[PDB]
Amino acid sequence: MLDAFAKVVAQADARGEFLSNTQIDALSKMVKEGNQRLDIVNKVTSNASAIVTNSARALFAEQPQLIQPGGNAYTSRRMAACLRDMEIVLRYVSYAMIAGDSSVLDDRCLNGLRETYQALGTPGSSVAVAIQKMKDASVALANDTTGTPIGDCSSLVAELAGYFDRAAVSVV
Amino acid sequence: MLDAFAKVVAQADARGEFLSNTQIDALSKMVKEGNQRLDIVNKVTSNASAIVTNSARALFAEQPQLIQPGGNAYTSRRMAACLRDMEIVLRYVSYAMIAGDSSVLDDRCLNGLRETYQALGTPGSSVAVAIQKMKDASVALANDTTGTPIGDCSSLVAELAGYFDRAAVSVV
Amino acid sequence: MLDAFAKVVAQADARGEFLSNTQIDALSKMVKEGNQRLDIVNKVTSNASAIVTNSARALFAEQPQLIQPGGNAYTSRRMAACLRDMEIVLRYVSYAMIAGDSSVLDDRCLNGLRETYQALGTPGSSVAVAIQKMKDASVALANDTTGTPIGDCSSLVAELAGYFDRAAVSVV
Amino acid sequence: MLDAFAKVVAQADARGEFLSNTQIDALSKMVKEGNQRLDIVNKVTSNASAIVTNSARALFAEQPQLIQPGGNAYTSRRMAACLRDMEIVLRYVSYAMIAGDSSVLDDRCLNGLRETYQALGTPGSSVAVAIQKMKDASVALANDTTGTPIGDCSSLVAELAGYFDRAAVSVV
Amino acid sequence: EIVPGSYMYLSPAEAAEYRAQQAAVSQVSAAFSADVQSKMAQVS
Amino acid sequence: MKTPITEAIATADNQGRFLSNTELQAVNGRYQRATASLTAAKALTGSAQRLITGAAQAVYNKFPYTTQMPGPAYASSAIGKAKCARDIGYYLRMVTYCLVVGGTGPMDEYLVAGLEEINRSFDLSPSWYIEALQYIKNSHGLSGQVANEANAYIDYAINTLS
Amino acid sequence: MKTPITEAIATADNQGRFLSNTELQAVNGRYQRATASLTAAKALTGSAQRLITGAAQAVYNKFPYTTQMPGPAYASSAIGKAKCARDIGYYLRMVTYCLVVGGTGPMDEYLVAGLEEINRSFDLSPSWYIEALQYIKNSHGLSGQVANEANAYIDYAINTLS
Amino acid sequence: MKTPITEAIATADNQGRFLSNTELQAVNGRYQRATASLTAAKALTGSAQRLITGAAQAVYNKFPYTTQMPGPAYASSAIGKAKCARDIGYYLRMVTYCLVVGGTGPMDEYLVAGLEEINRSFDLSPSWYIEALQYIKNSHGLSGQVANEANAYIDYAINTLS
């Protein structure tokens, strides 16, 4: 997989180049954000079961057909596999957040997921609503200031919510 | 796989219903003629080798181009594979006779079998002739009155004839 | 796999026939040139590393963009996979020269190789240039008399040049 | 496998105790030794091909019966395994240096190595000679103050030498 | 000893036959030493 | 156990590798954060009895049926009250073991592996233990990056029970 | 199949290796033998119609119940007698196929694989075919190393039936 | 890529887990080292052509047969000197990639994988490139922890060739 420092090395090599001082100075701007990026994945990991079950509870309150007899999240083995899917997607968005780009999310999670749900009969447009409810549960948690020094991590909040958007358009 | 009893249950669970009183009474009618159902698969199993080898012998008398050179049943390996295909299909019809429905016949035997014979170059219409030659051979045994109390099994024999007929249209 | 002799039997079994007198004498012609066929494959495998490393060196001087940055044989692993594939192709061509037909070359070397190269971005028309460079580096060596009794084996060299032409058109 | 921090935890759980302040303050002394420990491991891993090759070449100089025809280092497949066995032990000693205790040296390298060498006929006393020649080749390198701040780290070279004695008495 | 890792275990009769057949090729490397006197203008 | 040191060795032994700068930097990140986590384990150890008796009382205020309902699963007898404060001490002890080691290794081996068969058999409720661990998170009195280290292993135990 | 040429390619391809002199010495032993194998395959083909009817009449003398006992598995009808000589000709044809290829390659796929299920299902006794093959071994009329190659594949088919 | 970041994601994903503090400390140790490791890449890039044409001349001093002996594998022509200084710059550029990434990622993918098969086929002796890397190891001019980062990747390249 690639991280954000390995994505610039692969672009540079493909043209047989060194890295200029302008490119190095933009990679040490990525290092200085290093402790605020680690606080964001720590807040998502530490609350990871309340992200998943509060947003699954919300998903069936407003789409109650999914848990009725004949639905897809009916019959508790399929209920447990439904919550497994939300923890899986939340796991790889957490991986793509420390890496700095979404390549481990793209080929280990999202690659072939839309075609998997069509072979199972799972509503892939309702999985995207499940990802979108974990999106703002995780954003409201990362904007929350508890346990953190004063300062700024607002360009990183917009980045974490973009991996949740990429995961949600790849499944519809 | 399902039997006749779990077929009603799996259909009732997708509606979220209990079974009605006319569904329990239609199930207890299967129990009343359960001894005559077991006498049918006792006749078929006990002569299962003679059903296969007599109907295969009659298939090549009337289709003598299967065992000419170039034919699909010409070698030692292609001919013994024709005999075991008849013994597989005759085995999965008797699995559908004690179950009550053709759910083990469709899932384990007939699913994707027409496309397999098309990939092998096996003439699928002649496999249907061999299944129909096994149909009347085991119906003639099912109507035998030896070692049984005399009664009416004619609705059960017409069900066994429908399992061989389903296998013969699912293979061409 | 089949060789040349087993190919003739496979033609004759499908017609259910004994071999004729002319088919026997055509087979005793292949036995007569057996020492000239064994002498070719000995000439090719004894120089097998030099066929590959010189036909590659002529390819990168003719198409120099393959070793420039971004080129398909630019890194030490992409350079070593190029010399691997030429050695694989030359290996199965040597197999098809003692057998007498290209049955092992089609099944065990070429099956799906064109679609493998399209998915990689490897230029399939450049792989065909490197196989034709291995063709006339092997044909020129098979026509060399140093070590062999003097005689004409030009029909065998026109057969070896057809296995190289078969793999060259089956890669693009 | 365990490190030194989990060695003191596995012993406190077996008596159901919290760690006392003395065991905590003895662990934070190991933390401030941590930069000097990473210097020793870096000094070995960057000279690893010359630790193996020189102490091998110094072993077949004073023991020429090993590489004489009939010896247990003749016939380069056995010579390649003697160089692998030297590299394996030096690898797992440097693993037990960053850990702080030899639990990874004991199980996945040294458990069953006297038993293995006695099965093959390898002279296990000559292996102990080779292990003690990589000991004083890397004790001498960890005492080298090239590119380090000059402080005192004599207690960790007496620790690193002990893991080489542990592997040398375990094969004889 | 042939080379320091390759050896010949022969009987004391047949070890004379090994040494007196490579002195029987030492009289033809005394004869291709006159291939250096005719380095130029050999077969004219 | 899963420590940051045995997870750097295992990824280097899987590759047949000597310890490169990928692995020396990872062990160095353990040694940097070990100053903040060795004072969290020292401050949780020294105030342990204040935390155990407090966290067991926080279960009794929240779920007061556990002191009134008869039966062996509940803290209604004096035997069943000492078995509760025993269990709170087990969870607090594993958190200090993870702070000195770094990484959720001691409680993955001693506590969470086989825990659901214990709670199912003896009819213990995992929401009793979440309420006890949420007291210790709010009452350990740490601050800064010392509280950040301690709360990261409290929340691991809650996520295995939730 | 089981040509010596394909049984030399299959060992070199398993290691992923070129053809060494180990394989070229193997194929050279096929070519130094094929001057006797191809004179035996032509001599059996040119005397086939004498050999089939002679071997089919020999099993009627040894086992006379085949021409008398009713049932589809016996040579009492004209349908059963034409299928009996058909089977003798199938054994002689795979013998002459195995001589021009070298080694028991053609008769494995075409005659031996699945033979035991045919004789069990249609109730054909394998001792009828052994009596027929013992006639051909006695009176093919060959001698020298020509007859050694013919009896090598006759006795292979006897060993699979016995 | 053998980044400390992608090695942390891989140990978490091996057991299907979220990223705990075991893996966040490996990422944190990369950031503490990334200051000295990025000033080394800036200074090696700025002295690139000085170090490349110097290290090429040091190979022609120690191995003067490489400029005299005829053949395609040697630097005895104008093309062989252009391809020789191409290869010094390849080894230098991969070192600087490892300094901006952290850990021996780019050197393993782009340089070391398949190097032994190339140096055997084209008859390139690996002792030339060891001499060229020992020049850069002595002439980059850095000191402190900045040279300590730089030499750890010059030494890693020498251990692969040796």
Place this chain on the structure above:
Amino acid sequence: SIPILKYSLSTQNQRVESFEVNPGDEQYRIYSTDSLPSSSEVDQIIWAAYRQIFSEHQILKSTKQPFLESQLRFNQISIKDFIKGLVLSAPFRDLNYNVNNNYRFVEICVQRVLGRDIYNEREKIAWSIIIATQGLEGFIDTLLNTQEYLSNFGDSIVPFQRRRIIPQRSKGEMPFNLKTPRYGIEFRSKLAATQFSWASPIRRFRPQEQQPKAGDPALFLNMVQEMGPGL
């Protein structure tokens, strides 16, 4: 005695060498009992074998085999017997074998036990008659006793998807659990409690997916949280 029928090979990644000394982050974590693991590390071998044979979605409490686990912890069975014992287990027959036919069950067990894809369609046809005539117990024994299993994994390594990513690339072949789920397009129709087979995206009158434009004040929001110190 009915040998298996012959099929043709195909070009795949695992048939050919990667010249990769020093593998990277895409090396796929050998789990072996040849490294003498402790109790905490034999739990990781067991979870890796459950993930490989079952899905991640079938590692429920009702699925785990507690007695097959304890015979591995006492060195009574090998990892090849753990993998065989998971395929012949009652959860695997119920959730996977009963909702596939014989041809799609072969390609599940080739992908998950051998760690490679099928060569062609005729390889599914060739192996599906080992199931129908000998059962699952005979099919998994002739699949674990191939030379493809004993050379790659032996008898003490958990299988893995062999050679999924090429060493330069960032996008590799699809993982075998996302490529082949529990049941396919047949058995989907009505045999697995399913309706309507597709769904349009959810409509709403509060749009929820508005893309920001170039003058929006949240793109400059950066240092809005707090001003930097100094003078």
Place this chain on the structure above:
Amino acid sequence: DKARSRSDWGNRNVLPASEGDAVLGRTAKGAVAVPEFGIPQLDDPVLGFGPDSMVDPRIAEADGAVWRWDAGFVDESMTLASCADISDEAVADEAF
């Protein structure tokens, strides 16, 4: 509404469509914005990244533009490269 809060990144807005709409500091994906070009090593026609040095295959998966769900993935099944050259005379005369 505009993206105002850092709290509404999870609630309402998704991510910048184009890279000119990125956050103050970063690219469209969210990583830090680094200049694409460094110093070229070995400026040379025959040996060096010339104009016709073919593209890295690992430049797209490193981009993340090969995966279909990411915005960089352009599909060329409907672009002009997939249309037949009419100047080819084999294609004109057949299609006449």
